[PDB]
Structure 1
Amino acid sequence: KSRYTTEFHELEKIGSGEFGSVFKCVKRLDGCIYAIKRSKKPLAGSVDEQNALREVYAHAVLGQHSHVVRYFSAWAEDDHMLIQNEYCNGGSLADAISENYRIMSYFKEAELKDLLLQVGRGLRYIHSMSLVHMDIKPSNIFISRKVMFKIGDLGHVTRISSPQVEEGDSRFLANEVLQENYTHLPKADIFALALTVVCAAGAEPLPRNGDQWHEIRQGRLPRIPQVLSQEFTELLKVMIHPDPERRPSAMALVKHSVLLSASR
């Protein structure tokens, strides 16, 4: 007899986690399609509940922007927490990347700069709302169709000067965050965005740990299977600089000369 059951029709599963799943659903009264995550409700008062609620609070402030997915509603049922957000019809950036890997045709420089600029505009909004994302990666960027890239998955979002941080994907994690130096949190999103663009440019699967992981955190870009301009490659390289203060801010990124050609 639930709200979820009565107001929506499920069309297809689009996501799966440890204690939840995501469906593409049509809402019965308005006719429109939504992505609805349904997750097991955490125990009352726990730090898990506070974590889950930061995500609801994050969407409810961060969704006004064109490069963050819109939020529509969140509610608790008996044992479940639901979040109804915008459905992006083009899927994740990760699935596009996987397809591109198989066929040997990747995002070209002009598409990579458009990716960098659009997600950079989304981070710029996030950062000006006094928040950081903390988990930028291709599986958390979604595609609507020109192409529009939108940040989703707000489950690591925290305030910009937070003393406590749940770190995101190991493949995209800056070293300073791993060492618990949270002085420059916005520059973790910049570091992760750089390696997101490297993935899109056709790189091999990034390391989770080991020597190559440390190689990258020296400021070395992984091998990219295509010719990029030197100034674009150097923008990416400084975005993974070991000093986070040397990496550009999201405002400096969107105003960058290299990205002036991509500005719509």
Structure 2
Amino acid sequence: LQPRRVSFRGEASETQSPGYDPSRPESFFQQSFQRLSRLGHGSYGEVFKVRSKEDGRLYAVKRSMSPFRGPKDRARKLAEVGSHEKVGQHPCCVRLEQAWEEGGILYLQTELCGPSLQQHCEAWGASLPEAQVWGYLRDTLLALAHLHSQGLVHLDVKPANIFLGPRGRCKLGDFGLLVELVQEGDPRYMAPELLQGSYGTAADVFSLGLTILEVACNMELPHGGEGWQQLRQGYLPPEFTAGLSSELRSVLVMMLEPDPKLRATAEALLALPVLRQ
């Protein structure tokens, strides 16, 4: 059984590693990485914190759970590698180092950033200090501005797909649903125009608006029903918005504009005085 490199522009490496012995039963992932801990898991598979056995660097490796069920299953999983290729390098985006397949399992090796914003909020156990929130909002807007300037829509912006790096910075990741101007999204963060089949970069700004609202108010977002509709009418529900500053509420209202034709872009938001460097 051979591991096959899933090639993409920007992989930084063209070759197996000297430690890989193809005559051994263990997988390339087993032979080439020291497994340190499991960062997360789900129906998609597992994400491990690893050290490369070749150069000792820290990486994050995600592997799918079950072998490819067929060509379409494989194409859907491999598309996440193509999306990383379309994103390219940016300081606020998770960099894909390399990807390969073995035994029908897909492996994605990225830079190690840290826990997801969802995990960080679970540990903090309250509304995040608003100064931390502004930094995450700005860093993810920088990421969104990079994607949107290239005609890319993330379509899955949420705390689980933002990852914290050192010194309070974060990076947008998990590009499995990214499309170049489509799969089922998370309805909690879904822009209203997506229901009517209208897809644009504006949908990411709305999703980030609800993402910031969630972490800054420690409130759980509704999957549907009347509460879902409350958040798509241009106003903020009054209970949890009490603690937000005038400036933060002001930005969130701009991001949650229901009409995508009128909704501010990532570049417009980053040019506001409140979002200055």
TM superposition score normalised by structure 1 = 0.89
Give SS of 1:217's match.
coil
Determine if the alignment matches structure 1 residue 257 to structure 2 residue 273.
yes
Pairwise CA RMSD:
1.7
Q: Which residue of 1 aligns with 2:97?
A: 72
Q: Which residue of 1 aligns with 2:150?
A: 129
The answer to whether the 8 Å contact 1:134/1:157 transfers is yes
Determine if the alignment matches structure 1 residue 219 to structure 2 residue 219.
no
Give SS of 2:217's match.
coil
Aligned partner of 1:98 among 122, 125, 143: 122
Any stretches of 5+ residues in structure 1 without a counterpart? Answer: none
The answer to whether the 8 Å contact 2:217/2:243 transfers is no
The answer to whether the 8 Å contact 1:172/1:192 transfers is yes
Shift of 1:238: 2.0
Q: Which residue of 2 aligns with 1:83?
A: 108
Q: List aligned pairs for 1:13-162, cutoff 5 A.
A: 13-39=38-64, 40-46=66-72, 48-89=73-114, 91-100=115-124, 102=125, 104=126, 106-159=127-180, 161=181
Q: Supply the distance in 2 between the matched residues of 1:84 and 1:234 (Cα, whole angstroms).
A: 39
188-197 or 172-181, which deviates more: 172-181
4+ runs deviating over 6 angstroms: none
The answer to whether the 8 Å contact 1:140/1:152 transfers is yes
Q: Supply the distance in 2 between the matched residues of 1:113 and 1:245 (Cα, whole angstroms).
A: 25
Q: Which residue of 2 aligns with 1:9?
A: 34
Q: List aligned pairs for 1:182-201, cutoff 5 A.
A: 182=199, 185-201=200-216
Query: What one-letter code is carried by the residue in structure 1 that aligns with 2:193?
Result: E
Aligned partner of 1:207 among 222, 227, 230: 222
The answer to whether the 8 Å contact 1:218/1:242 transfers is yes
Q: Supply the distance in 1 between the matched residues of 2:44 and 2:87 (Cα, whole angstroms).
A: 24
Any stretches of 5+ residues in structure 2 without a counterpart? Answer: 1-25
Shift of 1:242: 1.2
Q: Supply the distance in 2 between the matched residues of 1:248 and 1:19 (Cα, whole angstroms).
A: 33
Determine if the alignment matches structure 1 residue 233 to structure 2 residue 249.
yes
The answer to whether the 8 Å contact 2:216/2:244 transfers is no
Shift of 1:53: 2.2
The answer to whether the 8 Å contact 2:241/2:249 transfers is no
* Paired residue total: 250
Task: For residues 62-108 of structure 1, give each alpha carbon's deviation from its aligned partner in whole angstroms, at most 9, with x where no partner exists.
Answer: 2411111111110010121100011123x1111221233x3x4x323
The answer to whether the 8 Å contact 1:97/1:199 transfers is no
Give SS of 1:199's match.
helix
Task: For residues 196-235 of structure 1, give each alpha carbon's deviation from its aligned partner in whole angstroms, at most 9, with x where no partner exists.
Answer: 1111212311111111001101122244365333233122
Q: Supply the distance in 2 between the matched residues of 1:41 and 1:243 (Cα, whole angstroms).
A: 42
**Among the aligned pairs, what percent are the same residue?**
37
Shift of 1:117: 1.0
Aligned partner of 1:173 among 190, 209, 212: 190
The answer to whether the 8 Å contact 1:14/1:22 transfers is yes
Query: What one-letter code is carried by the residue in structure 2 that aligns with 1:166?
Result: Q
Shift of 1:148: 1.2
Query: What one-letter code is carried by the residue in structure 1 that aligns with 2:269?
Result: L
Structure with the larger helix share: 1
Q: Supply the distance in 1 between the matched residues of 2:243 and 2:178 (Cα, whole angstroms).
A: 35
